[PDB]
RNA sequence: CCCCCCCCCCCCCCCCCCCCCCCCCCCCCCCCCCCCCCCCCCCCCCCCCCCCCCCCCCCCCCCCCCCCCC
């Protein structure tokens, strides 16, 4: 009564503080940023395809080029708007298509290029040159190139942005450690696409995206909001359906510990009753309700580096964290997860009880009632 | 009390996120799209009939031509409006009827053709040429062609869109695997129509529609909304009544697992009481209520590739999925369904109990009460 | 008719306060796993069948009200 009413709400107080700032910072991203408009979108897709048909393609620029497609889907105005909302000063760079004349192999030739701050009109033609090589070879092998194999396929842009989504998936750890997991999934999920494109090398493109995200961290914001806008969509090609699916696997990255909590509660893991865990409960509810209040935007807080994500940490509660992680251990869901319990005794006990849980399913008859049962 | 209040609502949080995007993407469909207006509709229907009276007809273009009829029913303005709503930039292409003069067999002839981006005025006349051949042969066989046998019949357009609807039915799996099922149904349901049209070859047209949907995936959106607008209708010919019926068989494709859930609950399958299934319940209700909240539009989420459809998956709950699928097994409704239980022990137990359920119907007397019963 | 007695009120004491006392002080970023989805089957309907039918206006008597006292 007396003392049981004394508490301090820290998790929600902190949100309230960061939510109600009366002033703002603004960052100076760099000297330029290219904001391709809707009108350029088809050409960027075409360029993406050129990379995908190129066998053993150099994927250095592919990360950056993917970002360009995504921005050309958002559109010049929408893309700037999302940059400004994030708070960065934007030197917007208009993107037009111009023809370039250059003699390759002696003979003078025409090329379709983009005016880009980020991409030399030199390294652009080099992608188209290399693509043609892998294309005439492709034409020699099958006599006639099918539409699913060409750089025209409307899927090309989105196909590249698929391994981008997979990169976002594992971006929670912040380092390149997700890479092998990214490849693995790209191989099962995307196996059909990899059959139609010799240049769909997961390792390489995944590295190129990691690269662009690490280097230009504002793009990670841009991409997240693109994916959201792409998943808002009413219908779409199976590839866009794949993209959206993969993109959404990243919702709630960094907060795995949170879901394994709901699990511990769901399976009624005994070690949740422990006195020293019960002591933490008052606050552990505070954070779960804060997660609830936050809603949808919250899932991506860890992928973008949103300071407010620190608040969802269950790390601050060692006893609870430990039994939750032990529960997940004993149910064989963790590993090769690199989280450590701060309480070995609790972790072990939770693991032990969890392991015993899968052994006996007891039928509970009071969930569904029947007025006459012979059995 | 304490811990039982802690939960995270993930299914609804995710919807909330995709519903409330502040930005949008837009796709560049291709170079052109033909948007036939109401005024051309009768001519397209006529062209459809020409294909239907042609014995052993080449159905390569029939898929695309069907889409044109549907668009000519929606009307130029309504059809563009649905494309823009889906988010695609539209190069609208006006469709006029012009006369073409060409010498076939030496003699010069007139033809009624459409100005179409998608269809050469060459391959158009070829359908009318082939139709005439099968028509004069038809005239020779029965002396005089009845109105139900000609290419004039107002049904022709809608008849073709019938196997289109059937293609939508099985589009849930995404591949051509529905094809044999599509044929089967076209044969029972449409047997009367197949009698009046030698050119109503299900396999061929079904393949042509699969073709157009796979190739131009925006058409699948257009067709879905056409069918909705066609089923909104107040009255109509028996064929339009067949179309609507078939079209609506596709409502809830991809969500069969969901209906088999409601079934498991309905038959009071015992394995729903199991501890490890009860553990999932809290969340499995979340998704069913999300389905409820979504309402009508939800049924087609899987057919169009609407990212939000991933959310209706009961896959995320292995224990529940397994007993639901086992229940459906034991009641002999699954197969040749290619879904797999993630819990063999539960699936087997549910199947076993389900098989035992059909054996004994016990009369429950407390649903209807009577103040005096001698028996 | 109503009405009819008596009758001002008040009257003491009293400022209030007065002590002690800043506060603070440790630790600690976070994160880390796996995983697209989907896949069966199925148009709907289908019987019988207009309705209605009788009787039947309503009404009818008695009667102003009031009247004392103060």
UniProtKB/Swiss-Prot annotation, chains A, B:
GO biological process, one term: symbiont-mediated suppression of host PKR/eIFalpha signaling
Keyword Phosphoprotein: yes
Compartments reported by the entry: Virion; Host cytoplasm
Keywords: Capsid protein, Helical capsid protein, Host cytoplasm, Host-virus interaction, Inhibition of host innate immune response by virus, Inhibition of host interferon signaling pathway by virus, Inhibition of host MAVS by virus, Inhibition of host MDA5 by virus, Inhibition of host NF-kappa-B by virus, Inhibition of host PKR by virus, Inhibition of host RLR pathway by virus, Interferon antiviral system evasion, Phosphoprotein, Ribonucleoprotein, RNA-binding, Viral immunoevasion, Viral nucleoprotein, Virion
GO molecular function, one term: RNA binding
Origin: domain of life: Viruses
Principal localisation: virion
Annotated Pfam families: Pneumo_ncap
UniProt PTM: Tyrosine phosphorylation modulates viral transcription and replication.
Coiled-coil residue spans: none
Effect upon mutating residue 267 to I: In strain: Cold-passage attenuated
Any one Gene Ontology cellular component term annotated for this protein: helical viral capsid
Modified residue annotations for Phosphotyrosine: 38
Region listing for Interaction with the phosphoprotein, in residue ranges: 31-252, 244-290, 338-364
Residue ranges crossing the lipid bilayer per the database entry: none
Assembly and oligomerization: Homomultimerizes to form the nucleocapsid. Binds to viral genomic RNA. Interacts (via N-terminus) with the phosphoprotein P (via C-terminus); the phosphorylated phosphoprotein P binds to N-RNA complex. When in a monomeric RNA-free form, interacts with the phosphoprotein (via N-terminus). Interacts with protein M2-1; this interaction allows the association of nucleocapsid with the matrix protein. Interacts with host EIF2AK2/PKR; this interaction inhibits EIF2AK2 phosphorylation of EIF2S1 and blocks EIF2AK2-mediated translation shutoff.
Function: Encapsidates the viral RNA genome by forming a left-handed helical nucleocapsid that protects the RNA from nucleases. RNA replication depends on the availability of soluble nucleoprotein. The encapsidated genomic RNA is termed the NC and serves as template for transcription and replication. Together with the phosphoprotein, sequesters host NF-kappa-B in inclusion bodies (IBs) thereby inhibiting this host defense pathway. May also act as a modulator of the innate immune response by sequestration of host IFIH1/MDA5 and MAVS into IBs.
Family: Belongs to the paramyxoviruses nucleocapsid family.
The name this protein goes by in its record: Nucleoprotein
Taxonomic source organism: Human respiratory syncytial virus A (strain A2)
